[PDB]
Amino acid sequence: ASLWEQFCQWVTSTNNRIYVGWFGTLMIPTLLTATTCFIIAFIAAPPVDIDGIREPVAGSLLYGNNIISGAVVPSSNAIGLHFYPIWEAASLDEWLYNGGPYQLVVFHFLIGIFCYMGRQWELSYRLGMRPWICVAYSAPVSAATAVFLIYPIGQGSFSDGMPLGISGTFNFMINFQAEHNILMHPFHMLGVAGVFGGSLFSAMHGSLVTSSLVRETTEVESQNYGYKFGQEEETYNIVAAHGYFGRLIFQYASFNNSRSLHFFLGAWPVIGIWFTAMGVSTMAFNLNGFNFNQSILDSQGRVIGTWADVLNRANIGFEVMHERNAHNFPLDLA
Amino acid sequence: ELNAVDAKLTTDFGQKIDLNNSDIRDFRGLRGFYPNLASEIIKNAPYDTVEEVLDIPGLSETQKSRLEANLGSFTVTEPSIELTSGDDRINPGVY
Amino acid sequence: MLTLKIAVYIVVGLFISLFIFGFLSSDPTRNPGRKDF
Amino acid sequence: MDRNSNPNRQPVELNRTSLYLGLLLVAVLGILFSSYFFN
Amino acid sequence: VELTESTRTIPLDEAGGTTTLTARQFTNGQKIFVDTCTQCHLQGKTKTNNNVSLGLADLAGAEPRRDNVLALVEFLKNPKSYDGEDDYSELHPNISRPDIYPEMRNYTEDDIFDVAGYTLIAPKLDERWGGTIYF
Amino acid sequence: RRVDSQLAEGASLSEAWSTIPEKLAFYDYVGNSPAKGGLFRTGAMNSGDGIAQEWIG
Amino acid sequence: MQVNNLGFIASILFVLVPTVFLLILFIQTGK
Amino acid sequence: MQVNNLGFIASILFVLVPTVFLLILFIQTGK
Amino acid sequence: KSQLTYDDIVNTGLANVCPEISSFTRGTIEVEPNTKYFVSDFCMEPQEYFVKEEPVNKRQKAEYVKGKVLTRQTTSLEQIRGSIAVGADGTLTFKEKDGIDFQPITVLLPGGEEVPFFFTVKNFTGTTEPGFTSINSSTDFVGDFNVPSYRGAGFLDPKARGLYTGYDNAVALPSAADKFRTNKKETPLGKGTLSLQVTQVDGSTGEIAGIFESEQPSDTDLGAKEPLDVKVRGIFYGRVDT
Amino acid sequence: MESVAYILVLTMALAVLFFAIAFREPPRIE
Amino acid sequence: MESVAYILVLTMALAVLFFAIAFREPPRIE
Lengths: 334, 95, 37, 39, 135, 57, 31, 31, 242, 30, 30
Ligand code: CLA
Ligand code: CLA
Ligand SMILES: CC(C)=CCC/C(C)=C/CC/C(C)=C\CC/C(C)=C/CC/C(C)=C/CC/C(C)=C/CC/C(C)=C/CC/C(C)=C/CC/C(C)=C/CC1=CC(=O)C(C)=C(C)C1=O
Ligand SMILES: CCCCCCCCCCCCCCCC(=O)OC[C@H](CO[C@@H]1O[C@H](CS(=O)(=O)O)[C@@H](O)[C@H](O)[C@H]1O)OC(=O)CCCCCCCCCCCCCCC
Ligand SMILES: CCCCCCCCCCCCCCCC(=O)OC[C@H](COP(=O)(O)OC[C@@H](O)CO)OC(=O)CCCCCCCCCCCCCCC
Ligand SMILES: CCCCCCCCCCCCO[C@@H]1O[C@H](CO)[C@@H](O[C@H]2O[C@H](CO)[C@@H](O)[C@H](O)[C@H]2O)[C@H](O)[C@H]1O
Ligand SMILES: CCCCCCCCCCCCO[C@@H]1O[C@H](CO)[C@@H](O[C@H]2O[C@H](CO)[C@@H](O)[C@H](O)[C@H]2O)[C@H](O)[C@H]1O
Ligand code: OEX
Ligand SMILES: [Ca+2]
Ligand SMILES: [Cl-]
Ligand SMILES: [Cl-]
Fold this sequence. Notes:
The PDB classes it as photosynthesis. By secondary structure, chain B is mainly α. Chain B has one domain. Helix content of chain B is 29%, strand content 4%. Chain B has a two-stranded parallel ribbon. Chains A and C meet through helix 1 and helix 2 of A and helix 1 of C.
């Protein structure tokens, strides 16, 4: 009945079109700030000296970039890991030249997505649901944290963070392959298993449900109209799906329990993305993928190349050309 | 059009060790030059003629005999600032 | 820049305090289930 | 506050003859002004 | 082919002499190389100073030349500059200074001989030995 | 008038005409009159005669 | 011919926009 | 930028044609 | 700053500031007419930046426009060693020898043009008017300095064209690869004029401080553009060894 | 290519004529 | 002017998002 109590009831209200919640009271300002600065920067930001060698990179549409090539450029290598808000620049133009929009957008984004995870738990609690949708959402959160926060921290610079753009993302991946051999890292391999399997199982489950729908419609209408929102009854025959799938492979390779099946569907890609996030997070500390260069020698001691050696040649090609003006010393130590 | 180092490569600088422009790694080929004698030569450049690489102050007998035994490996071209500025004759970025 | 810094600090402190005082205000009781705790 | 149905909504109609007249108008207007757009 | 007798035949001195490491000696030299020198001489390079590598041309251009076993053994006892001028005992790993290089203090004359021999035989088994840091 | 005032003071023809601000001379150019355009001559007046660079005198 | 490079988009849209307006209105008549 | 001079008409039509198809279909639903 | 440690100045922008003669005196460094004086820790702090706009007209005055530095507190030459040589005619010669004698600086001009330049005092030889017997308020070293190219000959443009490295053509366009005048990079050696007007002398410690005005070309981008004319004003400090 | 624009608008006009004649709303006596 | 095209398609996407959320078909229990 107090005004604070009234505000609390409104914030935690389950009748708002968009749930706010306490986590939302943080999510909304941070994500809105990040979105505004990101759109403005992507459209209009001046070039950014990412590599700190006074060689500004054009990232914005108005400076000659298309949607594919445009990006918000990570902050200058001269900044390193230093905190660089607007009020630490002698002018907004100095802030822009050194890639301040990247720091603002990433920090607000990171806070916003952690709050989004908390908000998912919060609404599940208010709806009397089970609480673990946020656990599944923690996989993409972990991956985003790896590329925007953990990798820069381990490498020592926000200039090494993933650029906020499409071609910027490819640059990040290529450089990452050149310096870490992520393809030959087992955690990336589990991430690929996670995403290939997640798509495989999405296709499998979708196709098996769609194949086993109960006849409810006529041939002139979409079969989707055979389901009514809120209906008691199941819209497909899991028994028929299991008969088909257990004959496609063998009876014991097929689920007869929807709860067990939906758990597997949730767990597989989530676990795979946790592994890949941890892989990126550990190569942040330069614990790289497998090195098998010159592993096979003949009796005289001559190197017999393998596919890993050819991959290494590709990596060396990427490595010698990257940041072509940024290195003064022979070893790329970060 | 050729830029200045490419044009320099068309001259004798592309055939022999150039006392006024060649970096310290090009002196590795003469036995006993890298690093001290090559350093002293690069420090006392430019030179107007190859012969006057023998007139560097403070040179000892061993270095003088070593320079005279290799006079024919040496050429002298005009100092191009595209190979000297920024201490490029000691470290051009080649490892 | 000082004006902007103070503005940002005020806004952030208000939002963080709102978060903390919200999750402190009997938040476990705000659910459709048992609310005795 | 509730979202009530507005009773002032009316259907809009364009008969086929009006479609043909409008299409011919748009066509001939394009025929007319294209030369001036290209200049 | 196998690690033949001609592969392990390397110059012992500058006066023309040749010695042959045994397979045990080649293996031992490789082991010491991998254990003590690869941190800086990986694949015949020199990370801290690639102007002075372990390539055959480089070893042969030192003063006096280091492309024979005895000169290499001497270099690992008393290291010098590329021109034989400056003392490098406090700057390059050597057995003469166990106080500053404790890692080398248990390598005997046979071990140093073996690692010099391996250093001379490795360039014959790899074209990329002694190249550019990235190559 | 400005030229004739300079001439009355004692300046030469080249000196007097040099007092004329290029901005003033620019206003005295029929290409800047708004009654010289066309209904379908679109865009900036620089898309016509071009960007003015300098008064030729 | 050195035509206005905007003439083609302009003519296309000048005709197509009212055309689609008319088509939308005609096709939904009777709902 | 020396872009393809046909890029703008192409992008405009690529989006507008399926857009109008969809709008026509949606607005006439229920006749 | 004389009693400040590294931990007290770090992150504070006090590392890019010129030292200042505290003892407010109008001293005089006495000079024998045929000797040489070493200058130990010469520092030049730039405070004002001006770039000569190039009007499209050819008889309009150019004029100097102020700029804002896009780079941060990385604009100062310091720890510079020089010599003061005295001619028989009382001429003082400043001869900068080495040190941190360059800093790349980028300024923004109104209208959005970024002008980087190689701010330097390299090989500066400044001379005063003949007839000086002391270093005082009237000392004003005027002379030329070298301005090397902003980008080195090892620099690579975004299409990997460079001077002694990189492509010599436009490899992305095989048929038109030898069309582009930018395929030829050059690094011509520019010249600047610097004046050191000395305003404060502390004869008890040999210190000199003053104001400077520099004039130098800007970066040309390996010859990709004509350089602008940059004017730099600021303060300097030096110590004279007696 | 302006020729394509001109032919296209003319063709639209002629096709509208064809449809307006061949497929008109049939006048009916009610 | 390609910038105008890019901004326009991005704006169409964002506006579709707004309408799809604010004005969606209301799910009803039948
Ligand atoms: C066929 C080949 C193949 C395949 C299948 C993959 C697959 C994968 N790679 Mg690999 N990669 C490959 C080749 C391949 N790669 C090659 C050849 C290279 C070298 C060039 C790499 C280099 C490489 C790197 C360097 C990285 C990967 C990563 C990944 C993963 C990316 C997906 C991910 O993390 O999602 C997780 C989900 C997210 C990242 C999304 C987060 C979403 C946030 C939380 C919210 C976003 C909201 C958004 C802003 C707005 C909402 C939209 C709407 C509301 C409007 C995935 C496992 C990445 C990885 O593992 O990340 C840790 C990674 O960093 N790969
Ligand atoms: C009062 C309104 C007004 C005015 C005076 C101007 C004036 C100007 N604008 Mg702006 N503009 C306006 C509205 C206006 N604008 C609006 C609403 C928009 C959004 C679409 C724009 C978008 C815009 C852009 C994008 C650009 C301009 C530019 C210009 C300049 C050149 C004008 C030109 O070439 O016209 C040409 C005008 C015509 C050829 C007249 C067209 C007449 C139509 C086609 C007749 C059709 C009538 C109808 C079909 C017949 C009736 C049929 C019957 C059955 C009913 C000029 C300063 C240009 C410029 O230089 O900017 C710096 C430029 O690039 N304007
Ligand atoms: C010419 C002659 C003589 C004739 C030849 C034939 C003959 C007579 C031969 C006799 C011998 C013979 C039969 C074969 C000998 C040769 C031989 C052994 C061949 C090798 C076989 C081979 C190469 C195949 C290997 C590939 C394979 C199929 C392996 C298994 C893969 C596997 C177990 C996948 C399942 C994945 C998995 C984890 C299961 C669930 C996936 C999933 C999420 C599904 C979604 C889902 C599941 C449900 O369950 C239901 C319910 C629903 C709703 C649902 O969504
Ligand atoms: C980058 C931008 C491009 C957009 C692209 C993506 C689309 C996003 C748009 C989604 C927003 C639409 C919600 C519709 C609201 C609605 O129907 O009712 C709005 C209702 C109340 O309005 C009404 O208010 C009425 C007021 S009164 O009492 O009648 O006076 C009252 O009837 C009652 O409270 C209620 O009915 O509000 C709520 O449900 C409570 C809060 C909702 C707002 C949450 C934040 C919205 C977004 C911020 C989150 C971060 C975003 C980051 C970047 C996108
Ligand atoms: C948002 C930016 C731009 C918006 C785009 C939308 C533009 C709107 C365009 C509307 C189209 C109007 C035309 C509809 C026309 C139409 O609906 O048909 C005629 C129509 C019939 O009216 P009724 O009262 O019978 O209404 C019946 C309903 O079916 C109409 O909705 O009356 C009018 O609209 C009269 C005014 C226009 C009459 C035009 C007739 C001229 C035809 C001659 C052909 C040219 C030949 C010339 C040879 C020289
Ligand atoms: C409502 C919830 C809580 C909100 C309360 C927070 C209010 C904000 C108080 C702190 C914000 C201002 O805090 C003050 O910022 C200025 C930045 O100009 C800092 O100033 C610092 O940097 C400036 C220039 O960058 C230097 O001149 C100064 O020597 C240095 O101390 C002060 O060290 C700090 O005390
Ligand atoms: C609230 C929603 C609106 C968002 C906020 C709007 C503010 C953003 C300002 C940008 C709008 C366009 O305004 C102006 O655009 C031109 C066009 O590139 C920019 O110009 C910039 O790029 C061009 C070409 O790349 C250069 O020639 C120019 O020197 C440079 O400054 C200006 O820097 C900007 O001030
Ligand atoms: O910033 Mn981005 O990429 Ca990480 O490794 Mn070192 O740094 Mn640079 O080189 Mn390779
Ligand atoms: Ca070791
Ligand atoms: Cl790169
Ligand atoms: Cl480096």
